Amino acid sequence: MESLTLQPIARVDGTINLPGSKSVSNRALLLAALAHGKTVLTNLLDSDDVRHMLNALTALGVSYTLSADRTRCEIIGNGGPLHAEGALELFLGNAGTAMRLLAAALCLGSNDIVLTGEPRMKERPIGHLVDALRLGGAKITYLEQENYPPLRLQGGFTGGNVDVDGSVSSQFLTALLMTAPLAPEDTVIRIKGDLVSKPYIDITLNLMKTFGVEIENQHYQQFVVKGGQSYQSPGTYLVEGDASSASYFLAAAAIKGGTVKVTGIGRNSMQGDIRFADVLEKMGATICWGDDYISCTRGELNAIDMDMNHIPDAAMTIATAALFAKGTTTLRNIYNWRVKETDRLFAMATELRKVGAEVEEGHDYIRITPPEKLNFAEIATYNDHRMAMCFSLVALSDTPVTILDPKCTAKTFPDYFEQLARISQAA
Numbered sequence: 001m002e003s004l005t006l007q008p009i010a011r012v013d014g015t016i017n018l019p020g021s022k023s024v025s026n027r028a029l030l031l032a033a034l035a036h037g038k039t040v041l042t043n044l045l046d047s048d049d050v051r052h053m054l055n056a057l058t059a060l061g062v063s064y065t066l067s068a069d070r071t072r073c074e075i076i077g078n079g080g081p082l083h084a085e086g087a088l089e090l091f092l093g094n095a096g097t098a099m100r101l102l103a104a105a106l107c108l109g110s111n112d113i114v115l116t117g118e119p120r121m122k123e124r125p126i127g128h129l130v131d132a133l134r135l136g137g138a139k140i141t142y143l144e145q146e147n148y149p150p151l152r153l154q155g156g157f158t159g160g161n162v163d164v165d166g167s168v169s170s171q172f173l174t175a176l177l178m179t180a181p182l183a184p185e186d187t188v189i190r191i192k193g194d195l196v197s198k199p200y201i202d203i204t205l206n207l208m209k210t211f212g213v214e215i216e217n218q219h220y221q222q223f224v225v226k227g228g229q230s231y232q233s234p235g236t237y238l239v240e241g242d243a244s245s246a247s248y249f250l251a252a253a254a255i256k257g258g259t260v261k262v263t264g265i266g267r268n269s270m271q272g273d274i275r276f277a278d279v280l281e282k283m284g285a286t287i288c289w290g291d292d293y294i295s296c297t298r299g300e301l302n303a304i305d306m307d308m309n310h311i312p313d314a315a316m317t318i319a320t321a322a323l324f325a326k327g328t329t330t331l332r333n334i335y336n337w338r339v340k341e342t343d344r345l346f347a348m349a350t351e352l353r354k355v356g357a358e359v360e361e362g363h364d365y366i367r368i369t370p371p372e373k374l375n376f377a378e379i380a381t382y383n384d385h386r387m388a389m390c391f392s393l394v395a396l397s398d399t400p401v402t403i404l405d406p407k408c409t410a411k412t413f414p415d416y417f418e419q420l421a422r423i424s425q426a427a
Protein backbone atom coordinates (compact mmCIF):
# COMPACT_ATOMS: atom_id res chain seq x y z
CA MET A 1 0.00 0.00 0.00
CA GLU A 2 1.50 3.27 -1.21
CA SER A 3 0.94 6.35 0.92
CA LEU A 4 1.83 9.99 1.22
CA THR A 5 2.14 12.01 4.39
CA LEU A 6 1.33 15.71 4.24
CA GLN A 7 3.05 17.91 6.78
CA PRO A 8 1.10 20.82 8.34
CA ILE A 9 0.63 23.73 5.94
CA ALA A 10 0.89 27.10 7.65
CA ARG A 11 -0.70 29.17 4.91
CA VAL A 12 -1.76 28.85 1.30
CA ASP A 13 -1.41 31.52 -1.31
CA GLY A 14 -0.80 31.58 -4.99
CA THR A 15 -2.13 30.81 -8.44
CA ILE A 16 -3.03 27.46 -9.98
CA ASN A 17 -3.57 26.97 -13.73
CA LEU A 18 -6.23 24.29 -13.67
CA PRO A 19 -6.07 20.97 -15.46
CA GLY A 20 -8.86 20.57 -18.04
CA SER A 21 -12.40 19.63 -17.12
CA LYS A 22 -13.00 15.89 -17.15
CA SER A 23 -16.71 16.45 -17.87
CA VAL A 24 -16.03 18.68 -20.84
CA SER A 25 -13.09 16.59 -22.04
CA ASN A 26 -14.94 13.32 -22.39
CA ARG A 27 -18.00 14.92 -23.99
CA ALA A 28 -15.81 16.88 -26.45
CA LEU A 29 -13.80 13.80 -27.39
CA LEU A 30 -16.90 11.73 -28.17
CA LEU A 31 -18.52 14.55 -30.13
CA ALA A 32 -15.28 15.21 -32.03
CA ALA A 33 -15.14 11.51 -32.90
CA LEU A 34 -18.71 11.48 -34.18
CA ALA A 35 -18.39 14.78 -36.04
CA HIS A 36 -17.38 15.58 -39.56
CA GLY A 37 -14.04 17.37 -39.89
CA LYS A 38 -10.97 17.80 -37.72
CA THR A 39 -11.42 19.10 -34.20
CA VAL A 40 -8.48 20.51 -32.28
CA LEU A 41 -9.08 20.38 -28.52
CA THR A 42 -6.79 22.41 -26.28
CA ASN A 43 -6.46 22.29 -22.49
CA LEU A 44 -7.76 18.71 -22.70
CA LEU A 45 -7.39 16.85 -19.39
CA ASP A 46 -4.73 14.16 -19.17
CA SER A 47 -6.09 11.77 -16.52
CA ASP A 48 -7.23 8.19 -16.25
CA ASP A 49 -10.82 8.90 -17.20
CA VAL A 50 -9.81 10.74 -20.35
CA ARG A 51 -7.18 8.16 -21.25
CA HIS A 52 -9.88 5.44 -21.10
CA MET A 53 -12.05 7.44 -23.49
CA LEU A 54 -9.05 7.99 -25.81
CA ASN A 55 -8.24 4.28 -25.70
CA ALA A 56 -11.84 3.44 -26.56
CA LEU A 57 -11.83 5.81 -29.51
CA THR A 58 -8.55 4.22 -30.69
CA ALA A 59 -10.11 0.76 -30.42
CA LEU A 60 -13.13 1.94 -32.40
CA GLY A 61 -10.87 3.10 -35.24
CA VAL A 62 -10.83 6.85 -34.59
CA SER A 63 -7.59 8.60 -35.61
CA TYR A 64 -6.12 11.37 -33.45
CA THR A 65 -2.83 12.81 -32.29
CA LEU A 66 -1.81 14.19 -28.88
CA SER A 67 0.73 16.84 -27.95
CA ALA A 68 3.64 15.94 -25.66
CA ASP A 69 1.71 16.91 -22.53
CA ARG A 70 -1.45 15.22 -23.84
CA THR A 71 -3.50 18.42 -23.49
CA ARG A 72 -3.80 19.23 -27.20
CA CYS A 73 -5.65 16.66 -29.29
CA GLU A 74 -6.33 16.76 -33.04
CA ILE A 75 -9.22 14.40 -33.76
CA ILE A 76 -10.17 13.21 -37.25
CA GLY A 77 -13.95 13.01 -37.07
CA ASN A 78 -15.63 9.81 -38.20
CA GLY A 79 -18.50 11.71 -39.80
CA GLY A 80 -21.13 9.58 -38.13
CA PRO A 81 -21.76 6.83 -35.55
CA LEU A 82 -18.78 4.72 -34.46
CA HIS A 83 -18.65 1.02 -35.20
CA ALA A 84 -17.06 -2.25 -34.22
CA GLU A 85 -18.15 -5.88 -34.25
CA GLY A 86 -16.99 -9.19 -32.83
CA ALA A 87 -18.02 -8.26 -29.31
CA LEU A 88 -14.97 -5.94 -29.17
CA GLU A 89 -14.33 -5.24 -25.53
CA LEU A 90 -13.76 -1.67 -24.45
CA PHE A 91 -12.26 -1.43 -20.95
CA LEU A 92 -13.31 1.84 -19.34
CA GLY A 93 -11.62 1.81 -15.92
CA ASN A 94 -13.97 3.52 -13.46
CA ALA A 95 -14.78 6.32 -15.88
CA GLY A 96 -18.52 6.77 -15.46
CA THR A 97 -18.70 9.46 -18.09
CA ALA A 98 -17.16 7.15 -20.68
CA MET A 99 -19.27 4.18 -19.71
CA ARG A 100 -22.57 6.03 -19.80
CA LEU A 101 -21.80 8.10 -22.91
CA LEU A 102 -20.53 5.16 -24.94
CA ALA A 103 -23.30 2.85 -23.73
CA ALA A 104 -25.74 5.14 -25.51
CA ALA A 105 -23.69 6.28 -28.49
CA LEU A 106 -22.71 2.81 -29.55
CA CYS A 107 -26.39 1.80 -29.77
CA LEU A 108 -26.59 3.67 -33.10
CA GLY A 109 -26.78 1.43 -36.16
CA SER A 110 -25.46 -2.12 -35.90
CA ASN A 111 -22.64 -3.02 -33.57
CA ASP A 112 -21.43 -5.81 -31.35
CA ILE A 113 -19.42 -4.23 -28.57
CA VAL A 114 -18.89 -5.00 -24.92
CA LEU A 115 -18.36 -2.26 -22.35
CA THR A 116 -16.69 -3.18 -19.08
CA GLY A 117 -14.31 -1.72 -16.51
CA GLU A 118 -12.82 -2.15 -13.05
CA PRO A 119 -14.69 -4.07 -10.37
CA ARG A 120 -16.37 -1.00 -8.89
CA MET A 121 -17.69 -0.05 -12.32
CA LYS A 122 -19.63 -3.30 -12.34
CA GLU A 123 -21.35 -1.99 -9.18
CA ARG A 124 -22.35 1.47 -10.51
CA PRO A 125 -25.91 1.50 -11.88
CA ILE A 126 -26.77 1.88 -15.51
CA GLY A 127 -30.23 0.29 -15.65
CA HIS A 128 -32.09 3.58 -16.08
CA LEU A 129 -30.07 4.28 -19.24
CA VAL A 130 -30.43 0.76 -20.62
CA ASP A 131 -34.19 0.95 -20.04
CA ALA A 132 -34.38 4.19 -22.04
CA LEU A 133 -32.14 2.96 -24.88
CA ARG A 134 -34.27 -0.20 -25.18
CA LEU A 135 -37.45 1.84 -25.42
CA GLY A 136 -35.77 3.51 -28.40
CA GLY A 137 -34.97 0.19 -30.05
CA ALA A 138 -31.54 -0.76 -28.75
CA LYS A 139 -30.56 -4.37 -28.09
CA ILE A 140 -28.55 -4.48 -24.86
CA THR A 141 -27.53 -7.47 -22.76
CA TYR A 142 -26.32 -7.45 -19.15
CA LEU A 143 -23.46 -9.94 -19.11
CA GLU A 144 -23.24 -10.10 -15.30
CA GLN A 145 -25.55 -8.37 -12.82
CA GLU A 146 -28.82 -6.97 -14.17
CA ASN A 147 -28.77 -3.13 -14.19
CA TYR A 148 -24.98 -2.85 -14.20
CA PRO A 149 -22.05 -3.08 -16.60
CA PRO A 150 -20.69 -5.04 -18.30
CA LEU A 151 -22.99 -4.57 -21.28
CA ARG A 152 -23.07 -6.18 -24.68
CA LEU A 153 -24.38 -3.60 -27.18
CA GLN A 154 -25.85 -4.87 -30.42
CA GLY A 155 -27.31 -1.64 -31.74
CA GLY A 156 -30.76 -0.70 -32.96
CA PHE A 157 -31.51 2.65 -31.32
CA THR A 158 -33.74 4.35 -33.86
CA GLY A 159 -35.47 6.99 -31.73
CA GLY A 160 -39.14 7.44 -30.80
CA ASN A 161 -40.74 8.10 -27.42
CA VAL A 162 -38.20 7.36 -24.70
CA ASP A 163 -38.77 7.70 -20.96
CA VAL A 164 -35.74 8.04 -18.72
CA ASP A 165 -35.38 8.10 -14.95
CA GLY A 166 -33.34 11.15 -13.92
CA SER A 167 -33.46 10.55 -10.20
CA VAL A 168 -30.19 8.64 -9.72
CA SER A 169 -27.86 10.02 -12.39
CA SER A 170 -27.98 12.89 -14.84
CA GLN A 171 -25.46 10.96 -16.94
CA PHE A 172 -28.18 8.76 -18.38
CA LEU A 173 -30.07 11.74 -19.81
CA THR A 174 -26.77 13.26 -20.94
CA ALA A 175 -25.92 10.10 -22.87
CA LEU A 176 -29.34 9.99 -24.48
CA LEU A 177 -29.22 13.64 -25.50
CA MET A 178 -25.84 13.22 -27.20
CA THR A 179 -26.95 10.10 -29.03
CA ALA A 180 -30.45 10.93 -30.20
CA PRO A 181 -29.58 13.58 -32.82
CA LEU A 182 -27.83 10.91 -34.91
CA ALA A 183 -30.70 8.42 -34.72
CA PRO A 184 -32.81 8.13 -37.89
CA GLU A 185 -36.15 9.05 -36.26
CA ASP A 186 -37.02 11.99 -34.01
CA THR A 187 -36.86 11.25 -30.28
CA VAL A 188 -38.93 12.66 -27.43
CA ILE A 189 -37.16 12.06 -24.12
CA ARG A 190 -39.52 12.28 -21.17
CA ILE A 191 -38.03 12.57 -17.65
CA LYS A 192 -39.99 10.28 -15.31
CA GLY A 193 -39.80 12.45 -12.24
CA ASP A 194 -36.97 14.22 -10.42
CA LEU A 195 -33.73 15.17 -12.16
CA VAL A 196 -30.56 15.24 -10.09
CA SER A 197 -27.25 16.91 -10.93
CA LYS A 198 -29.10 19.21 -13.28
CA PRO A 199 -26.16 21.52 -14.14
CA TYR A 200 -24.44 18.66 -15.95
CA ILE A 201 -27.29 18.60 -18.45
CA ASP A 202 -26.46 22.21 -19.26
CA ILE A 203 -22.84 21.20 -19.89
CA THR A 204 -24.07 18.51 -22.31
CA LEU A 205 -26.34 20.88 -24.21
CA ASN A 206 -23.59 23.48 -24.40
CA LEU A 207 -21.19 20.96 -25.94
CA MET A 208 -23.81 19.64 -28.38
CA LYS A 209 -24.47 23.19 -29.56
CA THR A 210 -20.75 23.78 -30.03
CA PHE A 211 -20.75 20.71 -32.27
CA GLY A 212 -23.70 22.00 -34.28
CA VAL A 213 -26.74 20.52 -32.62
CA GLU A 214 -29.58 22.04 -30.66
CA ILE A 215 -32.68 20.42 -29.23
CA GLU A 216 -35.93 21.58 -27.64
CA ASN A 217 -35.70 21.61 -23.85
CA GLN A 218 -39.15 21.81 -22.27
CA HIS A 219 -38.32 22.91 -18.71
CA TYR A 220 -36.08 19.84 -18.23
CA GLN A 221 -39.13 17.57 -18.11
CA GLN A 222 -39.08 16.64 -21.77
CA PHE A 223 -36.54 17.04 -24.55
CA VAL A 224 -37.55 16.98 -28.22
CA VAL A 225 -34.78 15.90 -30.55
CA LYS A 226 -34.85 15.91 -34.33
CA GLY A 227 -33.15 12.86 -35.80
CA GLY A 228 -30.95 12.62 -38.91
CA GLN A 229 -28.56 15.29 -37.74
CA SER A 230 -24.77 15.38 -37.95
CA TYR A 231 -22.21 16.79 -35.52
CA GLN A 232 -19.73 19.21 -37.09
CA SER A 233 -16.23 20.10 -36.00
CA PRO A 234 -16.13 23.51 -34.27
CA GLY A 235 -12.52 23.88 -35.44
CA THR A 236 -10.38 24.74 -32.42
CA TYR A 237 -12.07 24.32 -29.05
CA LEU A 238 -10.75 25.32 -25.62
CA VAL A 239 -11.68 22.91 -22.83
CA GLU A 240 -12.50 24.82 -19.62
CA GLY A 241 -10.33 24.27 -16.55
CA ASP A 242 -11.91 21.78 -14.13
CA ALA A 243 -14.16 23.50 -11.59
CA SER A 244 -14.36 20.39 -9.44
CA SER A 245 -10.55 20.21 -9.28
CA ALA A 246 -10.57 23.92 -8.42
CA SER A 247 -12.67 23.34 -5.31
CA TYR A 248 -9.77 22.01 -3.27
CA PHE A 249 -7.61 25.05 -3.84
CA LEU A 250 -10.38 27.61 -3.29
CA ALA A 251 -11.37 25.78 -0.11
CA ALA A 252 -7.73 25.69 0.99
CA ALA A 253 -7.67 29.51 0.90
CA ALA A 254 -10.97 29.74 2.73
CA ILE A 255 -9.37 27.65 5.48
CA LYS A 256 -5.77 28.87 5.53
CA GLY A 257 -5.21 31.73 3.13
CA GLY A 258 -4.00 33.98 1.90
CA THR A 259 -5.52 34.29 -1.55
CA VAL A 260 -5.61 31.41 -4.00
CA LYS A 261 -6.48 32.12 -7.62
CA VAL A 262 -7.42 29.35 -10.04
CA THR A 263 -7.22 30.09 -13.76
CA GLY A 264 -9.01 28.42 -16.61
CA ILE A 265 -12.52 29.00 -15.25
CA GLY A 266 -14.34 32.23 -14.56
CA ARG A 267 -17.72 33.85 -14.30
CA ASN A 268 -18.76 32.67 -17.76
CA SER A 269 -18.00 28.97 -17.18
CA MET A 270 -20.55 26.34 -18.09
CA GLN A 271 -19.67 24.06 -15.17
CA GLY A 272 -22.05 23.91 -12.26
CA ASP A 273 -19.19 23.44 -9.84
CA ILE A 274 -18.16 27.06 -10.08
CA ARG A 275 -21.13 27.51 -7.71
CA PHE A 276 -18.92 25.87 -5.08
CA ALA A 277 -17.44 29.37 -4.74
CA ASP A 278 -20.86 30.63 -3.63
CA VAL A 279 -20.83 28.11 -0.75
CA LEU A 280 -17.44 29.32 0.44
CA GLU A 281 -18.76 32.87 0.33
CA LYS A 282 -21.78 31.83 2.43
CA MET A 283 -19.36 30.28 4.92
CA GLY A 284 -17.50 33.57 5.24
CA ALA A 285 -14.74 33.52 2.65
CA THR A 286 -14.28 36.30 0.07
CA ILE A 287 -14.51 35.38 -3.61
CA CYS A 288 -13.33 37.37 -6.64
CA TRP A 289 -14.49 36.58 -10.15
CA GLY A 290 -12.69 37.26 -13.39
CA ASP A 291 -13.17 36.33 -16.99
CA ASP A 292 -10.64 33.53 -16.68
CA TYR A 293 -10.14 33.16 -12.95
CA ILE A 294 -11.89 32.69 -9.64
CA SER A 295 -10.03 33.48 -6.46
CA CYS A 296 -10.76 32.94 -2.80
CA THR A 297 -9.36 34.91 0.13
CA ARG A 298 -9.53 33.84 3.77
CA GLY A 299 -12.27 35.57 5.78
CA GLU A 300 -13.90 33.37 8.36
CA LEU A 301 -15.51 29.95 8.18
CA ASN A 302 -18.97 29.25 9.55
CA ALA A 303 -20.96 26.06 9.24
CA ILE A 304 -23.79 25.84 6.70
CA ASP A 305 -26.83 23.65 6.16
CA MET A 306 -27.50 23.34 2.44
CA ASP A 307 -29.01 21.16 -0.32
CA MET A 308 -25.94 20.27 -2.41
CA ASN A 309 -27.63 18.37 -5.24
CA HIS A 310 -26.44 20.95 -7.75
CA ILE A 311 -22.73 20.39 -6.96
CA PRO A 312 -22.40 16.75 -5.82
CA ASP A 313 -18.67 16.40 -6.56
CA ALA A 314 -17.41 19.73 -5.24
CA ALA A 315 -19.74 19.28 -2.25
CA MET A 316 -17.38 16.62 -0.87
CA THR A 317 -14.83 19.41 -0.43
CA ILE A 318 -17.21 21.20 1.92
CA ALA A 319 -17.37 18.04 4.06
CA THR A 320 -13.67 18.27 4.95
CA ALA A 321 -13.60 22.09 4.94
CA ALA A 322 -16.36 21.72 7.61
CA LEU A 323 -13.67 20.42 9.97
CA PHE A 324 -12.42 24.01 10.15
CA ALA A 325 -15.77 25.75 10.38
CA LYS A 326 -17.56 27.08 13.42
CA GLY A 327 -20.65 25.00 14.09
CA THR A 328 -22.23 21.87 12.61
CA THR A 329 -22.38 21.58 8.84
CA THR A 330 -25.11 19.62 7.08
CA LEU A 331 -24.98 18.70 3.39
CA ARG A 332 -28.33 17.49 2.07
CA ASN A 333 -29.86 15.79 -0.94
CA ILE A 334 -26.73 13.95 -1.94
CA TYR A 335 -27.99 10.38 -2.11
CA ASN A 336 -26.07 9.59 -5.28
CA TRP A 337 -22.79 10.01 -3.50
CA ARG A 338 -23.56 6.34 -2.69
CA VAL A 339 -23.35 5.16 -6.30
CA LYS A 340 -20.21 6.83 -7.52
CA GLU A 341 -16.48 6.03 -7.37
CA THR A 342 -17.23 4.57 -3.94
CA ASP A 343 -20.18 4.99 -1.58
CA ARG A 344 -19.06 8.50 -0.67
CA LEU A 345 -21.46 9.01 2.21
CA PHE A 346 -20.12 5.90 3.96
CA ALA A 347 -16.53 6.73 3.08
CA MET A 348 -16.66 10.42 3.97
CA ALA A 349 -18.32 9.72 7.29
CA THR A 350 -15.87 6.95 8.17
CA GLU A 351 -12.77 8.96 7.41
CA LEU A 352 -14.00 12.22 8.97
CA ARG A 353 -14.53 10.39 12.27
CA LYS A 354 -10.91 9.18 12.14
CA VAL A 355 -9.62 12.74 12.44
CA GLY A 356 -11.99 13.52 15.32
CA ALA A 357 -15.30 14.71 13.95
CA GLU A 358 -18.68 13.57 15.21
CA VAL A 359 -20.61 12.61 12.08
CA GLU A 360 -24.14 11.55 11.35
CA GLU A 361 -24.18 9.54 8.14
CA GLY A 362 -27.73 10.16 6.92
CA HIS A 363 -29.23 8.10 4.18
CA ASP A 364 -28.88 11.04 1.75
CA TYR A 365 -27.14 13.67 3.84
CA ILE A 366 -24.19 14.07 6.16
CA ARG A 367 -23.96 16.14 9.39
CA ILE A 368 -20.49 17.09 10.58
CA THR A 369 -19.55 18.46 14.00
CA PRO A 370 -15.87 19.36 14.08
CA PRO A 371 -13.63 18.48 17.00
CA GLU A 372 -11.92 21.18 19.03
CA LYS A 373 -8.69 19.95 17.44
CA LEU A 374 -7.93 17.43 14.72
CA ASN A 375 -5.86 14.34 15.32
CA PHE A 376 -3.59 12.37 13.02
CA ALA A 377 -5.13 9.65 10.90
CA GLU A 378 -4.14 7.38 8.07
CA ILE A 379 -6.94 8.04 5.56
CA ALA A 380 -8.35 5.22 3.41
CA THR A 381 -9.21 6.50 -0.05
CA TYR A 382 -11.52 3.84 -1.54
CA ASN A 383 -9.97 4.07 -5.02
CA ASP A 384 -11.59 7.50 -5.10
CA HIS A 385 -9.59 10.52 -6.27
CA ARG A 386 -11.87 12.85 -4.36
CA MET A 387 -11.38 11.16 -1.02
CA ALA A 388 -7.65 11.74 -1.40
CA MET A 389 -8.08 15.34 -2.46
CA CYS A 390 -10.70 16.19 0.17
CA PHE A 391 -8.63 14.78 3.00
CA SER A 392 -5.48 16.54 1.88
CA LEU A 393 -7.15 19.59 3.49
CA VAL A 394 -6.69 18.06 6.94
CA ALA A 395 -3.05 19.23 6.68
CA LEU A 396 -4.19 22.89 6.83
CA SER A 397 -4.11 22.42 10.59
CA ASP A 398 -1.56 21.61 13.27
CA THR A 399 -1.55 17.91 12.41
CA PRO A 400 0.00 15.97 9.55
CA VAL A 401 -2.25 13.50 7.69
CA THR A 402 -1.32 10.31 5.86
CA ILE A 403 -3.24 9.64 2.64
CA LEU A 404 -3.32 6.02 1.40
CA ASP A 405 -2.98 5.34 -2.34
CA PRO A 406 -2.35 9.00 -3.28
CA LYS A 407 -2.04 8.06 -6.95
CA CYS A 408 -5.79 7.49 -7.04
CA THR A 409 -6.03 11.24 -7.70
CA ALA A 410 -4.91 10.46 -11.26
CA LYS A 411 -8.51 9.62 -12.12
CA THR A 412 -9.02 13.36 -12.74
CA PHE A 413 -5.94 15.14 -11.42
CA PRO A 414 -2.59 13.37 -11.66
CA ASP A 415 -0.64 16.40 -10.46
CA TYR A 416 -2.87 17.17 -7.50
CA PHE A 417 -0.30 16.96 -4.72
CA GLU A 418 2.37 18.95 -6.51
CA GLN A 419 -0.23 21.65 -7.22
CA LEU A 420 -1.34 21.75 -3.57
CA ALA A 421 2.35 21.98 -2.63
CA ARG A 422 2.77 24.87 -5.07
CA ILE A 423 0.39 27.05 -3.04
CA SER A 424 1.53 25.68 0.37
CA GLN A 425 3.66 28.20 2.27
CA ALA A 426 5.63 27.83 5.46
CA ALA A 427 5.40 31.50 6.36
Ligand SMILES: O=C(O)C1=C[C@@H](OP(=O)(O)O)[C@@H](O)[C@H](O)C1
Pocket residue numbers: 022023024097168169170171174196197200312313336340
Ligand atom coordinates in the same frame (compact mmCIF):
# COMPACT_ATOMS: atom_id res chain seq x y z
O1 LIG B 1 -21.88 14.35 -16.48
C1 LIG B 1 -20.82 14.48 -15.87
O2 LIG B 1 -19.78 14.91 -16.36
C2 LIG B 1 -20.81 14.12 -14.41
C3 LIG B 1 -22.04 14.15 -13.70
C4 LIG B 1 -22.12 13.77 -12.24
O3 LIG B 1 -22.84 12.44 -12.09
P1 LIG B 1 -24.40 12.23 -11.59
O4 LIG B 1 -25.27 12.83 -12.62
O5 LIG B 1 -24.60 10.77 -11.48
O6 LIG B 1 -24.50 12.95 -10.28
C5 LIG B 1 -20.74 13.83 -11.56
O7 LIG B 1 -20.87 13.29 -10.23
C6 LIG B 1 -19.68 13.11 -12.39
O8 LIG B 1 -18.42 13.15 -11.74
C7 LIG B 1 -19.59 13.80 -13.76
